[PDB]
């Protein structure tokens, strides 16, 4: 059983809320600051930085993840500041709570009314806090997401919906013990309305059922995946240029999943899918496949001679991964809930994956990273994590990858387990080696590569020296 924090307050402590990797000395002092930030993000910014309309999908407030990774990551108190401060600039306006909806979310039929509508976040927060605080975090998870009630089957969708980030937020949840970042999770997946994502785990999970071939380790599926032709071919970097027509501004009017993957390789993906079924009585090795896996396709997705460099897209796979190994800590859930949710995560990872052009993992590119500095160790790339200057993306990538690396050492010797023990340092030093002085303009990313897959991506990267 977890210890949570209040769902009213943040409370972080260096000792008792660290979580699963982390900077050797925090700081009460930087702890401080962290809540303060937490709280002026809660009340004041929206879970989503842009109106859907404005770039054709919602941008989402990254802010939480950013401040608690790099409090994680051993930042001063002026540094989580900065960067906190930075990320507001761009921030939507907190929406109004209605303390009457909030009560009247108790009926299953106004529960449902109000799903998919960004104006309920604030709503929602407040009836999971009450929902914590009636029945406990525990049965929140089953109610919420695993019991296999049409509410939770609905929730256990959308927390993928929106590239993962309704999962990512519950993950990092669970991992520093907090009920209000709890909360804040189930609210962000409720208002999430991507339909396509209900569908593809619906009928994957329904294919899977007939276990019509042998289930492979995700790493194997990812291969399989590549050897498709129609899964191979189901994308473009079209959907990483569109541009609207009169403006000429970016948009994602048209999206991989939905107008590319799913619209042209369905069920070539659906029977890929089908495959990733997981054994309940062998969860640690299986979690740490998943984000072994997470891993092989982000930091495998390499094209000599250029830099080493991170697709935007696929690292939601690494950043996501970690949360399983919170699923598998916690003793309120079933063996077979906690493989259902590796499963749902895994076909999430094999949809993103085939979105960005099934890239071929290149780990001898990898492999052969010059490090810019001298001497680095993950706490050197910790310190350095903690001055990069995005939206968080870069940090939780590196501290996501350094956990794999741990939770991969026990199965270093097993071949489904690609990236091996020394590589997940030199990716980690190839990470934030890709970094620059100006990561971002106001929501616009530069550093990572967006496409992958597609040789054309690759132009602007510099050939490596
Ligand atoms: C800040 O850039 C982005 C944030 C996000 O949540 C989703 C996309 C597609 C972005 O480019
Ligand atoms: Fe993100």
């Known amino acids: 059983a977890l210890e ?18 982390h900077a050797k000395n925090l700081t009460d002092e930087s702890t401080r600051e962290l809540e303060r930030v937490l709280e002026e993000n809660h009340s004041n910014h929206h879970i989503f930085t842009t109106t859907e309309d404005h770039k054709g999908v919602y941008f989402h407030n990254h802010i939480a993840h950013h401040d608690i990774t790099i409090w994680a990551l051993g930042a001063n108190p002026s540094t989580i500041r900065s960067q906190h401060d930075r990320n507001s600039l761009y921030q939507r306006q907190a929406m109004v709570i209605q303390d009457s909806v909030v009560k009247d979310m108790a009926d299953p039929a106004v529960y449902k009314r109000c799903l998919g509508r960004e104006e309920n976040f604030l709503n929602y927060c407040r009836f999971f806090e009450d929902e914590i605080n009636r029945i406990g975090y525990q049965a929140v998870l089953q109610k919420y997401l695993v019991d296999g009630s049409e509410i939770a089957d609905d929730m256990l969708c959308r927390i993928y919906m929106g590239y993962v980030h309704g999962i990512i937020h519950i993950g990092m949840a669970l991992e520093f ?45 990812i291969d399989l995946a590549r050897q498709d032709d129609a899964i191979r071919n189901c994308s473009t970097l079209y959907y990483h240029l569109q541009k609207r027509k009169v ?21 070539e993906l659906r ?18 496949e998943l984000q072994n896996a997470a891993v092989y396709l982000t930091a495998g997705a390499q094209r000599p001679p250029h830099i080493c460099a991170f697709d935007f897209f696929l690292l939601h796979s690494v ?125 616009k990313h530069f550093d990572f590569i967006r496409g992958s897959g597609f040789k054309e991506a690759w132009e602007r990267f510099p050939l490596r020296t």
Not at 247 to 267: H, I, S
Request: with cysteine; net charge negative.
């Open 4 to 21: 949570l924090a209040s769902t009213s307050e943040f409370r972080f402590d260096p000792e008792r809320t660290p979580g699963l990797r």
């Open 177 to 221: 013990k907090q009920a209000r970042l709890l909360a804040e999770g189930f609210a962000q997946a409720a208002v999430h309305h991507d339909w396509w994502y209900t569908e593809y785990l619906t009928q994957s999970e329904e294919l899977a059922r007939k276990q019509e071939e042998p289930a492979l380790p995700l790493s194997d599926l």
């Open 247 to 267: 403006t000429g501004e970016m948009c994602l009017d048209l999206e991989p999943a939905r107008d590319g993957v799913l619209k042209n390789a369905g069920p």
């Open 271 to 288: 029977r890929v899918a089908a495959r990733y079924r997981v054994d309940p009585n062998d969860l640690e090795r299986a979690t740490a």
């Open 319 to 443: 950043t996501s991964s970690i949360g399983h190994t919170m699923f598998l800590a916690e003793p309120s859930l079933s063996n077979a809930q906690k493989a259902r949710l590796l499963e749902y995560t895994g076909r999430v990872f094999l949809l993103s994956y085939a979105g960005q052009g099934s890239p071929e993992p290149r780990l001898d590119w990898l492999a052969s990273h010059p490090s810019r500095l001298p001497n680095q160790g993950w706490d050197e790339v910790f310190d350095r994590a903690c001055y990069h200057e995005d939206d968080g993306h870069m940090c939780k990538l590196i501290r996501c990858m350094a956990h794999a690396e741990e939770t991969s050492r026990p199965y270093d010797h097993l071949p489904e387990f690609r990236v091996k023990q020394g590589l997940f340092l030199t990716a980690g030093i190839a990470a934030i080696d890709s970094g620059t002085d100006k990561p971002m303009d106001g929501t």
